Design a protein around this motif. Structure first.
Motif, PDB file in Angstrom:
ATOM      1  N   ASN A  48       0.830  -1.195   0.000  1.00  0.00           N
ATOM      2  CA  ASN A  48       0.000   0.000   0.000  1.00  0.00           C
ATOM      3  C   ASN A  48       0.866   1.246   0.000  1.00  0.00           C
ATOM      4  O   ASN A  48       1.750   1.403   0.846  1.00  0.00           O
ATOM      5  CB  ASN A  48      -0.962   0.006   1.188  1.00  0.00           C
ATOM      6  CG  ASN A  48      -2.234  -0.755   0.899  1.00  0.00           C
ATOM      7  OD1 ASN A  48      -2.347  -1.936   1.213  1.00  0.00           O
ATOM      8  ND2 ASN A  48      -3.205  -0.079   0.297  1.00  0.00           N
ATOM      9  N   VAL A  49       0.612   2.110  -0.974  1.00  0.00           N
ATOM     10  CA  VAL A  49       1.261   3.404  -1.088  1.00  0.00           C
ATOM     11  C   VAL A  49       0.192   4.465  -0.887  1.00  0.00           C
ATOM     12  O   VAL A  49      -0.969   4.283  -1.264  1.00  0.00           O
ATOM     13  CB  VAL A  49       1.979   3.549  -2.451  1.00  0.00           C
ATOM     14  CG1 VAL A  49       1.024   3.346  -3.596  1.00  0.00           C
ATOM     15  CG2 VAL A  49       2.697   4.881  -2.589  1.00  0.00           C
ATOM     16  N   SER A  50       0.563   5.546  -0.218  1.00  0.00           N
ATOM     17  CA  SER A  50      -0.303   6.708  -0.168  1.00  0.00           C
ATOM     18  C   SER A  50       0.552   7.937  -0.404  1.00  0.00           C
ATOM     19  O   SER A  50       1.782   7.876  -0.390  1.00  0.00           O
ATOM     20  CB  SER A  50      -1.067   6.801   1.153  1.00  0.00           C
ATOM     21  OG  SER A  50      -2.219   7.612   1.006  1.00  0.00           O
ATOM     22  N   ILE A  51      -0.106   9.061  -0.643  1.00  0.00           N
ATOM     23  CA  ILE A  51       0.584  10.272  -1.054  1.00  0.00           C
ATOM     24  C   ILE A  51       0.020  11.435  -0.259  1.00  0.00           C
ATOM     25  O   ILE A  51      -1.198  11.552  -0.092  1.00  0.00           O
ATOM     26  CB  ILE A  51       0.462  10.489  -2.575  1.00  0.00           C
ATOM     27  CG1 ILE A  51       0.965  11.861  -2.997  1.00  0.00           C
ATOM     28  CG2 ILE A  51      -0.947  10.255  -3.047  1.00  0.00           C
ATOM     29  CD1 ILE A  51       1.279  11.916  -4.443  1.00  0.00           C
ATOM     30  N   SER A  52       0.905  12.271   0.269  1.00  0.00           N
ATOM     31  CA  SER A  52       0.513  13.353   1.157  1.00  0.00           C
ATOM     32  C   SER A  52      -0.154  14.472   0.373  1.00  0.00           C
ATOM     33  O   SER A  52      -0.369  14.401  -0.837  1.00  0.00           O
ATOM     34  CB  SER A  52       1.719  13.905   1.905  1.00  0.00           C
ATOM     35  OG  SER A  52       2.410  14.846   1.097  1.00  0.00           O
ATOM     36  N   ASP A  53      -0.454  15.544   1.075  1.00  0.00           N
ATOM     37  CA  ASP A  53      -1.031  16.715   0.462  1.00  0.00           C
ATOM     38  C   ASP A  53       0.029  17.735   0.091  1.00  0.00           C
ATOM     39  O   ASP A  53      -0.305  18.874  -0.243  1.00  0.00           O
ATOM     40  CB  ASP A  53      -2.059  17.312   1.410  1.00  0.00           C
ATOM     41  CG  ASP A  53      -3.126  16.311   1.788  1.00  0.00           C
ATOM     42  OD1 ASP A  53      -3.363  15.381   0.994  1.00  0.00           O
ATOM     43  OD2 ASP A  53      -3.717  16.443   2.876  1.00  0.00           O
ATOM     44  N   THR A  54       1.301  17.351   0.148  1.00  0.00           N
ATOM     45  CA  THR A  54       2.398  18.253  -0.139  1.00  0.00           C
ATOM     46  C   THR A  54       3.395  17.581  -1.083  1.00  0.00           C
ATOM     47  O   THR A  54       4.334  18.228  -1.559  1.00  0.00           O
ATOM     48  CB  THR A  54       3.053  18.680   1.189  1.00  0.00           C
ATOM     49  OG1 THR A  54       2.017  19.050   2.101  1.00  0.00           O
ATOM     50  CG2 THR A  54       3.927  19.928   1.049  1.00  0.00           C
ATOM     51  N   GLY A  55       3.164  16.326  -1.437  1.00  0.00           N
ATOM     52  CA  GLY A  55       4.069  15.594  -2.290  1.00  0.00           C
ATOM     53  C   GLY A  55       4.955  14.622  -1.561  1.00  0.00           C
ATOM     54  O   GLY A  55       5.962  14.186  -2.126  1.00  0.00           O
ATOM     55  N   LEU A  56       4.610  14.261  -0.336  1.00  0.00           N
ATOM     56  CA  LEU A  56       5.465  13.452   0.520  1.00  0.00           C
ATOM     57  C   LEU A  56       4.870  12.052   0.527  1.00  0.00           C
ATOM     58  O   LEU A  56       4.017  11.728   1.347  1.00  0.00           O
ATOM     59  CB  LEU A  56       5.529  14.078   1.905  1.00  0.00           C
ATOM     60  CG  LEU A  56       6.553  13.667   2.950  1.00  0.00           C
ATOM     61  CD1 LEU A  56       6.876  14.874   3.793  1.00  0.00           C
ATOM     62  CD2 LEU A  56       6.008  12.584   3.826  1.00  0.00           C
TER      63      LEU A  56
END
Lengths: 172, 182, 49, 482, 162, 44, 129
Positions: D295-303
């Motif tokens: 599982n990959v997720s992605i922040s709201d800033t590109g992190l």
């Protein structure tokens, strides 16, 4: 990795607590994947099938027995160029966006439902689609623009005084 | 949401959250809330009975009226529907389209049969009695308060021996013959 | 709010469904029928032209 | 200085020249006076800096960051550890207020987490795959055993769904009030949760849906199959809108940036891809990761954050177009031109089940076998929410006001193309030079109708023939004209 | 021209002969090839095939004349019986066609044959006694009978058929 | 007899082919018996 | 499901996730084959060694039979042959494969079972219960 660590009473005879953890962690038995279907070939085949369902689908539905004694031998002199008409396919081959990109198949069949949200022809003042798009390119609600710019972007062109007589102008 | 004003109800007179058009318009939860059925999705069973009997009724009637298969399945369906007791008089043949409804297919329930037998004050404590497990029908005790007592078992839906309510009934009548346990 | 959504109607007046909502009235039946036959007469005389 | 974030991507008639100058001048002025708002933006984002060379950013763990962090954030750093139901799963709400957790055995809990207000707990006895909020605290949907349920805010079972024959990937399109389901059968179906109607039943025809994400920017749904195909869909066309070849074998996870530009995708052949979306260019690959990251997720800033089961790895600023921000795993040979993990945490023996960034705070929630854990991460939360749409300080009054306003501004389901700026144009019949007409007895009734129809056909044929007519050796020269 | 793609393969590869669509006199000419074409009546069967098709039956009906060679094609006129002035002629063809072709399709499904009818001349193809049954039902209806009575008569003729 | 008012979807060759191939009372009624048997069993 | 090798060295673990994985019994020879055969459309419901343990069959839900073999293009585990069952809407419900006579018995989810001589994939016997 896999297998990693359980030490139950019933499990983990070996693999005890290694608090030193130096010069005894060089196993690194990396598992390898498989050659499952070579899905590049399946993707190229689906891309080729969609490209074949494109490019204006031009049909050689020639006159099959008209004039030249067709059927059961007798291959006559004339070469059958009689009906080489082309149906109007969806996109030409060199006007899709899949020719440049790799492993990307987009398909540009136009939507009968989203016929409904565009004007059929251009409007009257804005004389073409570039000026019409550049007209409505910027929104005006307060969720996308500031307060002062929003109160400037809305006001009527004829801001009238509320309750008194509007006289005809007489300035010069 | 917020008991919308006129200018908002006229813009959206279609949305409603707590009921959609798959529950057939609050009917299941309404008749379950008024008629004490504990296991969920059972007015699906009640209205599926009252629609399915009319479904295979017309499916049996449009058959050509000469073959004995029609008479066989008609008589089996009518006597099966009579032996459980939603039809009072068995002579009704084609007018099972209109009478066997929720108010009759729930009239075979052990709470309302109990209340019509005057074994309880109301359904509100008849369900309490037959959930506490005081009420047998036939020889064996029955606990689920959705049981349909049939035609041939309505005569023998009586309290068990060795129970507090049977004891206080015989005490108030002052006939407590205490040889056979109560 | 009034000037903002009026400016929105003015900016989007060429969309087809809000055009077919903002256009139609209850024109009385006399005026509707007579304007309809005047329109078919004008189309006919444009065809002959 | 900031106008690229706020940017929105020769004539004859004099009044139209002046009008075009007025509208693009108004465009420039409104973009500048919108870009001059982040001076008035309320607070600044967070960061952990190396400030040396030996102090790497990923030799920092929860003990020291929780020591030198605020008390309120340290008490936000929860651990709702539960053991009697299975490997848990996270979904925060759209605003960062409520949390919805789901065990694989039977457990579904919808609860505040910055306040101890457990407002809907429900056990069941069937495997609950995932769950997500609909618009509020009020309604939350759970993809159960073989029927998706939606639930009221206290726990009353509002609706079983007669459709959605099973479900294991389910989320929400917020402005349209849409619920999107993808299951183990080859289906993807849209159900509006306002009118109650089903909208479309898109047959996938590509095997079971292994993973799914949502684009926020244009509300297309991103499926990922067992073919390695990442397809993008919407209920306009029954075909997939586009397809992609991300990885080989199946793809276990896929995650979209909130600006819709970047897609992270991790397969099962120990491979990660970074994609542009609006150009569909494979930006850079990542190989050599030891186990296939589930599982990959992605922040709201590109992190972004990989989750390899025992490990969780957060890379900061790994979405540029260069070849430098390729996310690597170790600085070798004295190379400061790599991208090491910005930080990382290693849980004990429990496989992490899913990620999720908390929306408007600096913490990454991760759910695993033994329960929940949040990780304090300094730059991985958008600091300055916009209160007209999302609001972590709601009341009952403004919650109902946002309900009635968004139900009034429900975008209709047709309006989600590949690019939602494309509803203002002309309909592919442009004519930039526009030709504005200036510069070019029942048998007997049927028989007379056929006569008039044949005359109209003959007049049409003669007008086209006249149009084509208007738009188009010695001895034979002597023997012409005969 | 719209059915020419389905006409010629049962004239070339199923049945052995060869075709030409002459635009000289707007006709169809059929040769038989001496080198490999069998079935010495196939020329006559294919000629009667395209003759039924150009006479007015549909192409599947004409293929049904091509295969199963014992189906012949009778033709007669309205003008032979009762002399049928034009108003009564309109009554006659409207009475035979019924409403939405329903009486014609009733005769079609009843007497195991298939009819077509021009403005004054009709054609019935099928087997010979079925031609005669359909012809006597048609001439009774064109003499002018209640359609219920001709329905009952065709129930009796269908009972003769079974 | 029913005297089927529709045109057909066959030919004369298909009519005589079914007459050739036909050469256990009514199959639509057998299917009707089977579906009403299944529905009656579900109801009981 | 699980299947054992003829010797006690390897097991094939077939799962509802689409991998069919080969796992060794002791860690001293773990570097031989810990591989993960993907490729089937939906669920892989069986995986069997052959008699000579150089061929690994894997059978899926929809009715695919994949024959993994160690051939060339170091060089590892390609798919040399694909077979299909072609039941209409009857997915594979249970399988087994006796290797000593090369017999693959497959029972579908509609009371049917077929059984095959596998390396040529000929239908020996098909009937329904």
């Amino acid at each position: 990795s896999t297998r990693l660590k359980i030490v139950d009473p019933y499990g983990g005879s070996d693999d005890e607590q290694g608090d030193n953890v130096f010069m005894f962690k060089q196993q690194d038995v990396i598992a390898e994947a498989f050659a499952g279907d070579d899905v590049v070939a399946e993707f190229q085949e689906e891309k080729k099938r969609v490209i074949d369902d494109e490019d204006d689908k031009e049909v050689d539905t020639t006159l099959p027995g008209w004039g030249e004694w067709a059927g059961a031998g007798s291959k006559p002199k004339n070469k059958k160029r009689k009906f080489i008409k082309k149906v109007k396919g969806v996109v030409n081959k060199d006007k899709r966006r899949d020719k440049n990109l790799q492993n990307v198949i987009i398909n540009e069949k136009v939507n009968k439902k989203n016929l409904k949200y565009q004007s059929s022809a251009v409007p009257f003042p804005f004389e073409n689609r570039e000026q019409y798009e550049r007209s409505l390119r910027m929104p005006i609600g307060q969720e996308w623009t500031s307060r002062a710019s929003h109160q400037e972007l809305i006001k009527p062109r004829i801001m009238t005084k509320p309750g008194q007589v509007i006289d005809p102008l007489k300035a010069p | 949401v917020r008991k919308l004003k006129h200018h908002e109800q006229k813009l959206l007179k279609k949305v409603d959250f707590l009921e959609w058009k798959q529950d057939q318009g609050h009917r299941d939860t309404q008749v379950m809330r008024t008629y004490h059925i504990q296991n969920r999705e059972d007015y699906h069973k009640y209205n599926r009975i009252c629609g399915d009997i009319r479904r295979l009724a017309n499916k049996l009637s449009l058959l050509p009226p000469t073959d004995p298969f029609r008479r066989k399945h008609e008589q089996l369906l009518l006597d099966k529907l009579y032996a459980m007791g939603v039809l009072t008089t068995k002579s009704k043949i084609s007018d099972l389209e209109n009478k066997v409804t929720v108010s009759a297919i729930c009239r075979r329930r052990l709470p309302v049969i109990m209340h019509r037998l005057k074994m309880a004050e109301t359904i509100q404590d008849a369900v309490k009695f037959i959930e506490q497990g005081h009420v047998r029908v036939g020889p064996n005790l029955i606990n689920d308060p959705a049981y349909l007592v049939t035609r041939n078992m309505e005569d023998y839906v009586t309290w068990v021996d060795n129970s507090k309510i049977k004891k206080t009934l015989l005490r108030y009548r002052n006939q407590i013959d205490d040889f056979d346990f109560s | 709010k009034l000037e903002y959504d009026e400016k929105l109607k003015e900016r989007f007046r060429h969309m087809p469904e809000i055009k077919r909502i903002s256009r139609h009235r209850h024109v009385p039946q006399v005026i509707k029928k007579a304007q309809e036959i005047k329109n078919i007469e004008l189309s006919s005389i444009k065809r002959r032209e | 200085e900031n106008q690229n974030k706020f940017e929105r991507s020769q004539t004859k008639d004099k009044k139209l020249r002046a009008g075009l100058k007025k509208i693009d001048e108004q465009y420039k002025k409104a973009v500048s006076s919108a870009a001059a708002t982040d001076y008035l933006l309320p607070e600044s984002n967070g960061y952990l800096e190396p400030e040396n060379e030996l102090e790497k950013t990923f030799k920092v763990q929860q003990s020291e960051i929780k020591s030198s962090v605020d008390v309120s954030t340290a008490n936000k750093a929860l651990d709702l550890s539960l053991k009697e139901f299975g490997p848990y799963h996270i979904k925060y709400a759209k605003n960062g207020t409520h949390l919805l957790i789901t065990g694989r055995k039977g457990h579904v809990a919808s609860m505040d987490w910055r306040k101890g207000q457990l407002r809907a707990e429900l056990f069941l006895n069937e495997t609950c795959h995932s769950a997500t909020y609909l618009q509020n605290e009020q309604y939350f949907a759970v993809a159960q055993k073989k029927y998706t349920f939606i639930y009221d805010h206290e726990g009353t079972e509002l609706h079983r769904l007669k459709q959605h024959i099973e479900a294991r990937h389910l989320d929400f399109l917020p402005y349209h009030y849409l619920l999107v389901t993808a299951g183990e059968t080859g289906w993807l179906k849209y159900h509006d949760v306002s009118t109650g109607q089903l909208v479309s039943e898109l047959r996938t025809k590509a095997g079971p849906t292994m993973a799914m994400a949502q684009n926020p920017w244009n509300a297309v749904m991103h499926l990922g199959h067992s073919n390695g195909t990442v397809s993008l869909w919407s209920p306009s066309m029954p075909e997939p809108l586009v397809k992609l070849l991300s990885a080989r074998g199946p793809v276990n996870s896929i995650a979209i940036d909130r600006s819709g530009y970047y897609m992270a995708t991790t397969g099962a052949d120990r491979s990660m891809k970074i994609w542009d979306i609006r150009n569909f260019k494979q930006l850079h690959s990542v190989e050599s990761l030891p186990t296939p990251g589930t599982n990959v997720s992605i922040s709201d800033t590109g992190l972004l954050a990989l989750s390899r089961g025992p490990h969780v790895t957060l890379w900061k600023d790994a979405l540029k177009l260069s070849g430098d921000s390729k996310p690597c795993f170790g600085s070798m040979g004295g190379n400061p031109h790599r991208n090491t993990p910005y930080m990382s945490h290693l849980f004990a023996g429990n496989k992490v089940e899913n990620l999720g960034f908390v929306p408007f705070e600096d913490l990454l929630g991760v759910g695993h076998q033994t329960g929940i854990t949040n990780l304090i991460v300094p730059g991985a939360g958008e600091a300055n929410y916009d209160a007209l749409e999302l609001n972590p300080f709601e009341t009952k009054k403004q919650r109902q006001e946002q309900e009635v306003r968004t139900l009034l501004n429900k975008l209709p389901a047709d309006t989600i193309t590949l690019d939602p700026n494309s509803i203002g144009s002309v309909d592919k019949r442009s004519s930039t030079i526009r030709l504005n007409a200036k510069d070019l007895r029942s048998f007997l009734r049927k028989k007379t109708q056929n006569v008039i129809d044949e005359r109209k056909l003959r007049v049409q044929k003669q007008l086209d023939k006249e149009k084509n007519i208007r738009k188009r050796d010695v001895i034979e020269e002597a023997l012409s004209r005969f | 021209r719209n059915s020419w793609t389905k006409i010629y393969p049962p004239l070339v590869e199923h049945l052995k002969l060869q075709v030409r669509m002459n635009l000289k006199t707007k006709s169809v000419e059929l040769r038989t090839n001496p080198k490999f074409t069998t079935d010495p009546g196939a020329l006559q069967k294919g000629a009667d095939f395209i003759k039924a098709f150009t006479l007015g039956f549909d192409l599947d009906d004409s293929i049904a004349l091509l295969r199963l060679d014992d189906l012949y094609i009778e033709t007669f006129e309205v003008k032979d019986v009762k002399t049928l002035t034009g108003d009564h002629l309109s009554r006659a063809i409207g009475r035979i066609a019924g409403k939405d072709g329903k009486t014609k399709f009733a005769i079609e499904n009843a007497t195991r044959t298939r009819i077509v009818l021009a403005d004054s001349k009709i054609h019935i193809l099928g087997g010979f006694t079925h031609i005669r049954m359909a012809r006597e039902s048609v001439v009774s209806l064109i003499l002018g009978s209640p359609p219920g009575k001709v329905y009952g008569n065709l129930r009796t003729v269908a009972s003769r058929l079974k | 007899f029913e005297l089927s008012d529709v045109k057909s979807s066959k030919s004369l060759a298909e009519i005589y082919e079914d007459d050739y191939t036909r050469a256990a009372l009514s199959e639509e009624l057998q299917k009707a018996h089977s579906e009403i048997s299944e529905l009656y069993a579900n109801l009981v | 499901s699980l299947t054992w090798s003829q010797d006690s060295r390897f097991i094939l673990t077939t799962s509802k996730d689409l991998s069919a994985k080969i796992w060794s019994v002791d860690s001293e020879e773990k570097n031989l084959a810990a591989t993960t055969f993907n490729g089937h459309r939906d669920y892989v419901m069986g995986a069997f060694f052959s008699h000579d343990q150089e061929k690994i069959y894997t059978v899926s839900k929809d009715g695919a039979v994949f024959v993994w073999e160690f051939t060339k293009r170091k060089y590892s585990w390609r798919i040399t042959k694909k077979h299909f069952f072609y039941a209409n809407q009857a997915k594979v419900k249970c399988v087994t494969f006796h290797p000593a006579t090369r017999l693959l018995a497959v029972g579908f989810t509609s009371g049917e079972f077929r059984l095959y001589d596998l390396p040529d994939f000929t239908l020996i016997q098909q009937l329904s219960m």
